[PDB]
């Protein structure tokens, strides 16, 4: 599997969670950020590793990172 | 599909019948395509072994005759199918 | 007549591989015998001894040549994807009796395509 | 002679066609029964199909 | 360039035709026509229609060389997307084909990965620019001494 | 003053420079051919 | 219901704009942080659907650029006119066609380009040009430099109106959307006003004009001692002493006598003996016949008076058992989307090039053109080459309609619809026949070279050896040889020599002559076959999975030009239309480069040459494709290597830009390669070296320097890439014919 990881200069946009196509990603309550709010990375057993989330992350540099693991059936995308 | 095998019947006739109007002269003979057609295979049916060459006219004969036949008996299923 | 399902699964259904009935060895029999026999053809005419007198020899040794390739192909298949043993064709036991009957079938029908050559030359 | 006879016929059948053949005749007019537009078009099929007809006999040594 | 400028100085050194060198070698065509068009008429007559030669295998070699090079710009040009996609259609086409779908894939067939394509286009590159210099500095020297 | 704001937009004046520079070049390159020293 | 309504005054003509760049978008309106926005700016240039939302604005931006092209058409016409008339030998070689090479272009005397204006006769020296002008204004009738000024002038003059209407009609007198959506009443007038009467108009000028000029000039008069056109209007003895049907006037006409016009309309076939042409005869009744056709032809559609067919009536009447709802919808797709309509123009405009491409070489329409072997490989190539850029822009703008324009509402159950539900039936079919192809086609010169390389050429597919002949081809050779006075009865002479018949010669050159097809000729059309399915696999799967794959469930929402959708699911990179689009430009280079090397070598081998007094054909390359052209390595040595001797032996000569441009080209492709073979991550990261040495010396720029985007590097990738093995072919091409030729 992949592995998404959230640092802490994540201020809560949202924009990752929205951009992901395989509902990785969700927002939780977290008190860090002016939003109220973190990103959170609980399904990453169905992260296809597309890197739409760091596209979208605002932060300079991403607050949000996916580093590229084993492949699978899920990772690969695959339909076969 | 109704499908309807007297369809090809009626393609067999319809075409022939069609084919066998007298033409001009040259490279057909003036007695029609399957009066020239009928007339290929039977002085290449009589050397049954030695097929024809590029050179005689039985080829054209031969593909006019079916792409006239094809076109009358495809047009054949769309009429008998769908009235 | 559907064509599309009808004519095409009933047809499918009474070829060796799917036929009710036969045993491993008789499908791979089947099969053999179907592509030994025509194996021989490219083999024989297209072969760099089809100007020879080696000609026919040359095409039917090739053939079994071919078939030895594919038998053990076919047998590297059946172990690698069946773990599991059994008496239908997908299976360990099974699939090794394919395989024999088709070796049997495709070596013989070669030698019978070789023989009809000769008796019809 | 033959050419003025075929022509007048040739349009005068592409004008009984017409009434069948076009989609909604007018039969807002005297005797042909068609609106100038519909007599126009029909006439004009007459001419094509007339002047193809009688150079089909010329060809043919017919007329 | 190295290899190139070696090979061409000593070809000219070796004819006793310096002066074809120093005079041809301060522009680039010189190097197209009296290094690698010039030089290149015994090798890719190895074979021809009339027969063939010692030089054979080095002008099958050099074709094979130019093939393999080529064979590389699809892996380096073409990437990954393209291909998967390519395959996902031939895995359906497989699975639906009647007595061919008895036989099942243990792994899952995919496109090379991003990194391996560059690999693998690299070493056609790499194989085929190597192979098609081996075959003509070795038959260009060979048929002209 | 609008076309002067166009006519001083980057691809307008390269344009105009560089075929002043070779203007420039190709008449030194008329009236003074074949210059291979100074 | 068909009316012109516009709206007036919809946009005022101020520079304000000019002042502004990327106005025209949003995104570039707010002006450059960085040097992508630069490029941005030049890409989104055109994209007038991206711009605005409104289909109204879209097709009136379409129709004012469009008179831009026709206006920058009308000043290139005008300019070749002009140089024909004041710097060509075009007047000297009406009096020596053969002799004299056609030349419209002299270089100024400056740092020793001068040796550019070649040898060419007609007292001029200047660059040979293989445009075939010369033929095409000496079929016109044109005789003098006045009749090429004034056509020069009235060029302008077109260019100038053009430049006004595109101005008018955005500017002052903008249709509405309704006025484009006019489909039926569009088709009635290009059909019969624009095709129908320009052929018309045409026929006109050929009876008039070209037939008497040319007559006069093939009896042997002296161009300045024939009559100038207008005289043949006005003086209809001087016509009926050439044509004496002109005697009979306009009679035999409305009379439908038409037998009587046998002098100036015929049915000859074949070439004239004199130029190795088509009779102008033969031309000008086929322009009558077509006219005729296309005027007919274009009453077909509904306008404003009931009669007629509505377009939308067909296409859903066009409903069968096996088709679902037929061609429901594809009348408001073709109303609604420019793209949908610019893929099938461009498909057919693309494939007319190849058409024209291959009846104009094998029916040589001008005087003087089939032995001028330069001019007939430049024009074969040429429109090869605008067709098979066309046809990829076909795959282009198919799948910008995918991407764009496509919904499911229009397009349930008809034809677009269940093509895109059986897609993996189609590509995976269509990919299975492209590996059959190419195995089978490319795999007969790989068996070949091996068999050649083993000394076994008895176990070659040869016309001495294992024959494969076109038994196919050669038949359709012997029925069109049978054709006149036969199937074709009033036909006196085959449509094409190509096909059998006759060697025709102008002078010792051969004009046409029978093109005979064995095992080269099978092979190599397997070869083109093979291209051409491959590339109809890349551009039709960039079509059929523009909006989605089971690798991008959502690639619609991506768009049509996205590098990738990243490293993930394996790697996504170049699944877009877009990529799809690139990679057809290769192969298409590929398919297109091979089908003008067949043609290069076939006609030189077999075709074009000299025929002595006794009667002997000496082809240019003595009949050498039949043995060499069934290995790759006769290919490389007696196609490549042998025929490169002319442009690599340039250099000193009047061929020498050729020779220039054989390297410049080779360079340019190369120079590709960086593009194609690297990645922006490389090239960001060294800007960022070169930008700290900036910023060390206070002369960094404000516009931040950017690597390329990975879609512009695939773009100047794969335009260097063209742009360099197309020039190196044409300075290959021209040099050898200009030469040999
Ligand atoms: C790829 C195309 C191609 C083709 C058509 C040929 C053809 C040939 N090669 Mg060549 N060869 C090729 C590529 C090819 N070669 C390449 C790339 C190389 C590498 C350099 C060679 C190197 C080579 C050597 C060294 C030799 C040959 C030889 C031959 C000949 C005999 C081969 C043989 O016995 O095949 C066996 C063929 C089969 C077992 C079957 C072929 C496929 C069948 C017919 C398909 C049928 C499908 C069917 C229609 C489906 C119907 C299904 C259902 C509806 C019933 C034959 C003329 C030999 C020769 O002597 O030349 C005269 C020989 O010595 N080849
Ligand atoms: C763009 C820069 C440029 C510059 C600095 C010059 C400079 C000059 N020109 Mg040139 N000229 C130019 C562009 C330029 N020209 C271009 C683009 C054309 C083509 C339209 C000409 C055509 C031209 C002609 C016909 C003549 C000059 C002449 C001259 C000289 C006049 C004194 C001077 C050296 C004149 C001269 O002195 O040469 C005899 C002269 O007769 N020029
Ligand atoms: C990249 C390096 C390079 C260098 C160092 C040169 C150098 C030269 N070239 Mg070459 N050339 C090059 C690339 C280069 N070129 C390329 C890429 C091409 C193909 C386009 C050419 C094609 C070319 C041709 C066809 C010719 C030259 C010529 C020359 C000479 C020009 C002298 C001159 O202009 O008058 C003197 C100019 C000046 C002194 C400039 C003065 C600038 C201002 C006005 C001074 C202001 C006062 C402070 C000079 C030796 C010419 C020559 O005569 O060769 C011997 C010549 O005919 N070049
Ligand atoms: C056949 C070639 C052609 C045609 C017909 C057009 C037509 C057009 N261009 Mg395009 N353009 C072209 C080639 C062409 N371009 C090329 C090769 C590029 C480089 C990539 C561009 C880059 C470009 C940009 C950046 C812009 C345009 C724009 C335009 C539009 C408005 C221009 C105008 O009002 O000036 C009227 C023209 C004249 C009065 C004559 C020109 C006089 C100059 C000085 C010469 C018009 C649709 C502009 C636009 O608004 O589009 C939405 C715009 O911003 N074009
Ligand atoms: C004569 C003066 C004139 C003026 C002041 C205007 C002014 C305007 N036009 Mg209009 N227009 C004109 C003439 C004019 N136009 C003409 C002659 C046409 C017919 C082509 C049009 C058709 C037209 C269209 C379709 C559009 C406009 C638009 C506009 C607005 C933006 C234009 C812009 O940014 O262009 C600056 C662009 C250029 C200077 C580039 C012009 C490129 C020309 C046409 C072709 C170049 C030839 C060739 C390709 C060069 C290759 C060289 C080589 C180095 C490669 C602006 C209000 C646009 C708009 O959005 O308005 C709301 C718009 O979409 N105009
Ligand atoms: C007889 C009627 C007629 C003719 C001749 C044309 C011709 C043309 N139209 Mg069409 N058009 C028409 C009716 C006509 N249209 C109608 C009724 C509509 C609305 C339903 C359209 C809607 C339309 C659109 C939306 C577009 C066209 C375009 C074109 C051009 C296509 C490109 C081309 O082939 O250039 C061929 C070029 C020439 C033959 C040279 C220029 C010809 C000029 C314009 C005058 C021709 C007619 C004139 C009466 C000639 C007088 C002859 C003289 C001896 C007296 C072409 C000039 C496209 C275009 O490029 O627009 C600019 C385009 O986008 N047309
Ligand atoms: C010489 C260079 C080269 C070669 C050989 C290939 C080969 C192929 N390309 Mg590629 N391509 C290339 C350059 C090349 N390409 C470049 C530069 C690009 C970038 C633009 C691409 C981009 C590209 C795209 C986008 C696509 C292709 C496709 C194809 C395949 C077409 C189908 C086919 O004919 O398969 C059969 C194989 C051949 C014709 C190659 C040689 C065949 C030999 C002679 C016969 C068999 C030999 C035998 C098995 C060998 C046994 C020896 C072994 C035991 C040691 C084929 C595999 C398409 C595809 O996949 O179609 C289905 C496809 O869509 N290519
Ligand atoms: C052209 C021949 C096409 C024959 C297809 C048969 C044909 O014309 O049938 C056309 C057939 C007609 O269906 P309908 O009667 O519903 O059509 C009514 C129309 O008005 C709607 O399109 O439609 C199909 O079944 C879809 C085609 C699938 C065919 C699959 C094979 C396609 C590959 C063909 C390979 C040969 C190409 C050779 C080219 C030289
Ligand atoms: C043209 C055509 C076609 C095709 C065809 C085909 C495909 C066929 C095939 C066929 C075949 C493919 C056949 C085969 C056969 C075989 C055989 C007949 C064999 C046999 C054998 C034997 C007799 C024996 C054996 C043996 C021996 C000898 C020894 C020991 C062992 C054994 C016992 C095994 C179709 C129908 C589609 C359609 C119509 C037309
Ligand atoms: C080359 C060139 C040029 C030139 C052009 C020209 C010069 C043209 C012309 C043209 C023309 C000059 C045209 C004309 C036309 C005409 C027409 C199109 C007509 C028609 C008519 C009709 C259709 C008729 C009808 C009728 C009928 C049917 C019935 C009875 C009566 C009558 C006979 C009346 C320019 C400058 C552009 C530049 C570029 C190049
Ligand atoms: C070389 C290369 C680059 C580097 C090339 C760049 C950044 C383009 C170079 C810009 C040129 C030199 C134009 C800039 C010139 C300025 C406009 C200044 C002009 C000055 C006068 C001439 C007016 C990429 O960015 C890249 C990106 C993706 C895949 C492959 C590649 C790639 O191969
Ligand atoms: S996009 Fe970045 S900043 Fe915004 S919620 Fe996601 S990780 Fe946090
Ligand atoms: S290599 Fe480039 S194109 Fe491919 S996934 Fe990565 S960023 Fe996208």
Redesign the interface.
């Known amino acids: 599997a992949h592995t998404v990881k959230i640092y802490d200069n994540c201020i809560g946009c949202t924009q990752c969670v929205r951009a992901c196509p395989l509902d990785v990603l969700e927002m939780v309550p977290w008190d860090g950020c002016k939003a109220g709010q973190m990103a959170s990375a609980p399904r990453t057993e169905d992260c296809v590793g597309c890197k739409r989330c760091e596209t979208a992350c605002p932060t300079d540099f991403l607050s949000i990172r996916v580093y590229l693991g084993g492949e699978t059936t899920r990772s690969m995308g695959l339909a076969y | 599909?109704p499908?309807n095998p007297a369809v090809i019947l009626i393609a067999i006739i319809g075409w022939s019948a069609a084919a066998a109007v007298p033409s001009?002269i040259?490279?057909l003979g003036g007695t029609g395509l399957t009066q020239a057609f009928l007339a290929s295979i039977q002085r290449l049916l009589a050397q049954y072994p030695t097929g024809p060459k590029?050179?005689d006219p039985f080829?054209?004969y031969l593909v006019v005759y079916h792409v006239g036949l094809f076109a009358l008996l495809i047009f054949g299923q769309?009429g008998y199918?769908?009235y | 007549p559907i064509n599309s399902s009808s004519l095409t699964r009933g047809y499918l259904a009474q070829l060796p591989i799917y036929r009710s009935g036969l045993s491993p060895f008789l499908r791979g029999l089947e099969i053999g015998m179907a592509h030994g026999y025509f194996l021989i053809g490219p083999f024989v005419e297209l072969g760099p001894l089809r100007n020879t007198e080696m000609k026919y020899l040359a095409g039917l040794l090739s053939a079994v040549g071919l078939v030895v390739i594919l038998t053990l192909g076919m047998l590297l298949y059946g172990y690698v994807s069946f773990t599991n043993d059994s008496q239908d064709v997908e299976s360990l036991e099974g699939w090794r009796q394919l395989a024999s009957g088709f070796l049997l079938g495709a070596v013989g029908g070669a030698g019978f395509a070789y023989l009809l050559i000769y008796s019809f030359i | 002679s033959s050419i003025p006879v075929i022509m007048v016929i040739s349009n005068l059948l592409a004008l009984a066609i017409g009434r069948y053949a076009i989609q909604n005749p007018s039969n807002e007019t005297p005797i042909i029964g068609l609106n100038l537009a519909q007599l126009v078009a029909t006439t004009s099929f007459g001419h094509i199909i007339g002047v193809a007809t009688i150079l089909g006999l010329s060809n043919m040594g017919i007329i | 360039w190295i290899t190139f400028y070696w090979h061409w100085k000593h070809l000219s050194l070796w004819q006793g035709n310096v002066a074809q060198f120093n005079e041809s070698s301060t522009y680039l065509m010189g190097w197209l026509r009296d290094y690698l068009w010039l030089n290149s008429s015994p090798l890719i007559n190895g074979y021809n229609p009339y027969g063939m030669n010692s030089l054979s295998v080095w002008a099958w070699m050099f074709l094979f060389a130019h093939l393999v090079w080529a064979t590389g710009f699809m892996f380096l040009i073409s990437w990954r997307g393209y291909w998967q996609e390519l395959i996902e259609t031939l895995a359906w086409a497989h699975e639906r084909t009647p007595l061919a779908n008895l036989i099942k894939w243990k792994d899952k067939p995919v496109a090379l990965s991003i990194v391996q394509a560059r690999l693998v286009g690299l070493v056609h590159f790499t194989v085929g620019y190597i192979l098609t210099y081996a075959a003509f500095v070795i038959a260009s020297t060979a048929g002209k001494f | 003053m609008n076309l002067k704001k166009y006519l001083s937009t980057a691809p307008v004046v390269a344009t105009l420079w560089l075929f002043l520079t070779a203007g420039i070049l190709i008449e030194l390159n008329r009236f003074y051919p074949d210059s291979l020293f100074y | 219901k068909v009316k012109v309504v516009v709206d007036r005054d919809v946009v005022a003509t101020s520079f304000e704009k000019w002042a502004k760049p990327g106005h025209f978008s949003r995104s570039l309106a707010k002006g450059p942080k960085t040097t992508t926005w630069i490029w941005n700016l030049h890409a989104d240039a055109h994209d007038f659907d991206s711009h605005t939302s409104s289909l109204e604005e879209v097709s009136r931006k379409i129709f004012s650029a469009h008179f831009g092209q026709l206006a920058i058409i009308f000043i290139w016409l005008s300019g070749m006119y002009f140089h024909g008339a004041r710097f060509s030998n075009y007047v000297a070689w009406l009096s020596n066609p053969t002799g004299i090479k056609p030349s419209a272009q002299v270089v100024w005397p400056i740092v020793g380009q001068q040796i550019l204006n070649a040898d060419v006769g007609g007292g001029i020296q200047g660059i040979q040009i293989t445009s075939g002008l010369f033929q095409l204004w000496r079929a016109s009738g044109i005789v003098n430099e006045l009749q090429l000024y004034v056509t020069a002038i009235g060029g302008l003059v077109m260019a100038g109106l053009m430049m006004f209407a595109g101005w008018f009609h955005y500017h002052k007198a903008a249709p509405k959307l309704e006025w484009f959506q006019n489909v039926e009443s569009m088709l009635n007038h290009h059909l019969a006003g624009l095709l129908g009467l320009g052929s018309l108009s045409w026929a006109g000028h050929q009876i008039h004009v070209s037939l008497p000029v040319n007559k006069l000039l093939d009896a042997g008069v002296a161009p300045s001692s024939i009559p100038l056109p207008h005289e043949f209007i006005l003086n209809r003895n001087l016509m009926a002493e050439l044509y004496p049907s002109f005697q009979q006037g306009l009679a035999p006409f409305f009379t439908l006598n038409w037998k009587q016009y046998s002098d100036i309309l015929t049915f000859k076939g074949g070439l004239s003996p004199v130029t190795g042409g088509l009779w102008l005869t033969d031309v000008a009744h086929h322009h009558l016949a077509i006219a005729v056709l296309f005027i007919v032809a274009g009453h077909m559609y509904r306008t404003n008076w009931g009669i007629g067919h509505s377009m939308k009536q067909l296409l859903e009447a066009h409903k069968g058992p096996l088709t679902g709802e037929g061609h429901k919808g594809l009348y408001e797709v073709l109303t609604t989307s420019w793209h949908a309509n610019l893929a099938i123009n461009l498909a057919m405009l693309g494939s007319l090039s190849i058409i024209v491409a291959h009846h104009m070489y094998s029916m040589p329409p001008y005087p003087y053109l089939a032995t001028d072997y330069p001019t007939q490989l430049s024009l074969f190539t040429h429109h090869m080459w605008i067709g098979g850029f066309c046809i990829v822009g076909a795959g282009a703008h198919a799948a910008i309609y995918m991407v764009r324009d496509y919904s499911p509402t229009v397009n349930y159950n008809n034809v677009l619809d269940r093509m895109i539900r059986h897609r993996d039936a189609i590509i995976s079919h269509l990919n299975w026949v492209c590996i059959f192809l190419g195995t089978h086609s490319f795999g007969l010169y790989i068996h070949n070279d091996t068999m050649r390389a083993l000394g076994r050429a008895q176990d070659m597919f040869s016309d001495t050896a294992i024959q494969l002949q076109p038994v196919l081809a050669q038949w359709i050779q012997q029925i069109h040889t049978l054709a006149p006075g036969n199937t074709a009865v009033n036909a006196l002479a085959t449509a094409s020599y190509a096909f059998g018949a006759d060697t025709v010669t102008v002078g010792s050159k051969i004009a046409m002559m029978p093109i005979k097809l064995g095992t080269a000729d099978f092979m190599v059309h397997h070869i083109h076959a093979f291209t051409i399915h491959v590339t109809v696999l890349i551009l039709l799967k960039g079509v059929l999975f523009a909006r989605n794959s089971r690798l991008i469930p959502d690639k619609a929402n991506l768009g049509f030009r996205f590098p990738c959708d990243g490293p993930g699911r394996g790697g996504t990179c170049q699944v877009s239309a877009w990529d799809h689009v690139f990679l057809g430009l290769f192969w298409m280079y590929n398919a297109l480069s091979v089908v003008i090397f067949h043609f290069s070598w076939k006609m030189q081998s077999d075709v074009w040459g000299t025929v002595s007094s006794n009667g002997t054909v000496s082809h240019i390359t003595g009949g050498n494709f039949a043995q060499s052209a069934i290995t790759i390595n006769g290919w490389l040595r007696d196609f490549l290597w042998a025929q490169a001797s002319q442009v690599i032996q340039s250099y000193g000569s009047s061929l020498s830009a050729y020779g220039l441009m054989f390297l410049g080209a080779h360079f340019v492709w190369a120079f590709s390669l960086m593009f194609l073979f690297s990645g922006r991550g490389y090239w960001q990261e060294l800007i960022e070296s070169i930008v700290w040495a900036h910023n060390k010396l206070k002369v960094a720029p404000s516009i931040a320097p950017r690597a390329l985007s990975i879609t512009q590097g695939r773009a100047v990738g794969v335009a260097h890439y063209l742009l360099g093995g197309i020039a190196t072919t044409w300075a290959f091409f021209l040099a050898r014919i200009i030469s040999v030729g």
């Open positions: 599909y499908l001009n040259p490279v590029l050179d080829w054209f769309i199918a769908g």
